Amino acid sequence: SGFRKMAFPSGKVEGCMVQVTCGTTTLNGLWLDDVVYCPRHVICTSEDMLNPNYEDLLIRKSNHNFLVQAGNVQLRVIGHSMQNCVLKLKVDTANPKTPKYKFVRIQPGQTFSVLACYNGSPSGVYQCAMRPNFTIKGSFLNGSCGSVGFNIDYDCVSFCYMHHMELPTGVHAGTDLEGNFYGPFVDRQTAQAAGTDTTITVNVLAWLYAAVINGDRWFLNRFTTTLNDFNLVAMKYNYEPLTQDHVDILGPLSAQTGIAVLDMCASLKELLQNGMNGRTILGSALLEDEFTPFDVVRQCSGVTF
């Protein structure tokens, strides 16, 4: 029993974290095989961040300008190239701790674990979701750039995020491992704001199923709804539309609990229109949307890595 926000074990990723120093900037790098991946803004000064020409700044750099440190061992940079907003530093040594990995770009609503690092050293692991406005509500201080987001599927690490910046509201913006930003963000010091966020509906439903599996049933009702009528209510309350794909994905949880997805949607509709009335669900007075249906099945069944 119990339901916690749970991250993947971070060991496979900890063995890849390195410190990248370029001039006065120090941030984190991801060392996989003989390449160190890090945010391209490591080559910027304070003025170079205001209006940057990264091709021009990079051409002026030499391999010895990049100081890569893996623990207390300095790695030798033998090449450098840029792929979108990520800098790739070719090193003379393949990381012996390189796990089986893939670079995957995730969709909003998908969750992943973040290994927050400072000076190439892991300091914390937490779970979060890619918000529908493409920001993440992370926990990052100065020096955390280059920290990565990942999932594990069997023994393969899927790297899905690299930290680049903090927006004025305190939320975070970053890229996939190919350097493509999630959201309409740019890696420069300019006016940028996160769009109005919405609730990840399929994830709330998954968390309501996790609550039922854990013995919390007060919110269940005799009613059902059409998918279209539910989406009218969801639009009203700044909730993401629920698709037939989401209904299908929730199938196993629906079969296990005996509560059809549209039956759980009618419970969610009542919670949205009436609130919790002083009650909690899984120790929360708000509807939680950072657990996907796969996370709920993984935690309530005990899948290992």
Place this chain on the structure above:
Amino acid sequence: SGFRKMAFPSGKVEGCMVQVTCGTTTLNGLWLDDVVYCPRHVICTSEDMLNPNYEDLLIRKSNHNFLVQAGNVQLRVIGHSMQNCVLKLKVDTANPKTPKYKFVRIQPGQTFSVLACYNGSPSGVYQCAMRPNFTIKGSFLNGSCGSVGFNIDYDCVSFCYMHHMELPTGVHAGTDLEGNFYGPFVDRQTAQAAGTDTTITVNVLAWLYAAVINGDRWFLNRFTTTLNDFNLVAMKYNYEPLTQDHVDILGPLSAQTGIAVLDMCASLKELLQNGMNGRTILGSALLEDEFTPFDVVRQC
């Protein structure tokens, strides 16, 4: 900016997780140097649930009865001894991935990371607090016994918890790494119940300081309170008494935010009386008590 429930990176502990099988029972072991630590109840049969005599059950065991598996490699048990509720299996190989470590017994209110494991394999990491009633609100299924709780403040792993059992309310009880249970619990299936839980007051205050550091101030007020008046109010909402030790511990956060502890206590009294009125604090509609003052300073 931002404030998340954050666990320590689990890599140093993952390299210590092994599977321990004894008869029909399989659970997790912690492999440090040449010793595998695990709950002694791994030696219990179906008839030794209510009143096991662990000394008697253990004397009947031989080293080859314990099957220890580290990955796809079977370790050879060359000795076995019991220390309180923990079984120590001497193995013929020192774990090459043994980190720098310590065994520390924690106090209620203290937080730690849990590396939940099944069959010696890590499946997830989450952050817990030792509740004032000495239980933990974990997420554990059957097979999670032997999963450990730890802190990794700089380089060294401090092991503070080993999972042993789930109480009827779905909360969890376990021991420190010396086999001493936290709470009045025993490793028997005899009727046991967690006492009435209370809120870790010093941790709620620490989290209110974290919210102020992060820009939230709506809950602040112009009032202060005596420590005694705060305790008289707080105990009516099942909050733990706030001691002078707790007031002192909150000193640095008080200095950093400019809000005296007793001033923040008056905000907490007001929140308890009024609720949040549709507002949130750090993305939460409830007062969070699983962040210590040390966690808040660490994360901010």
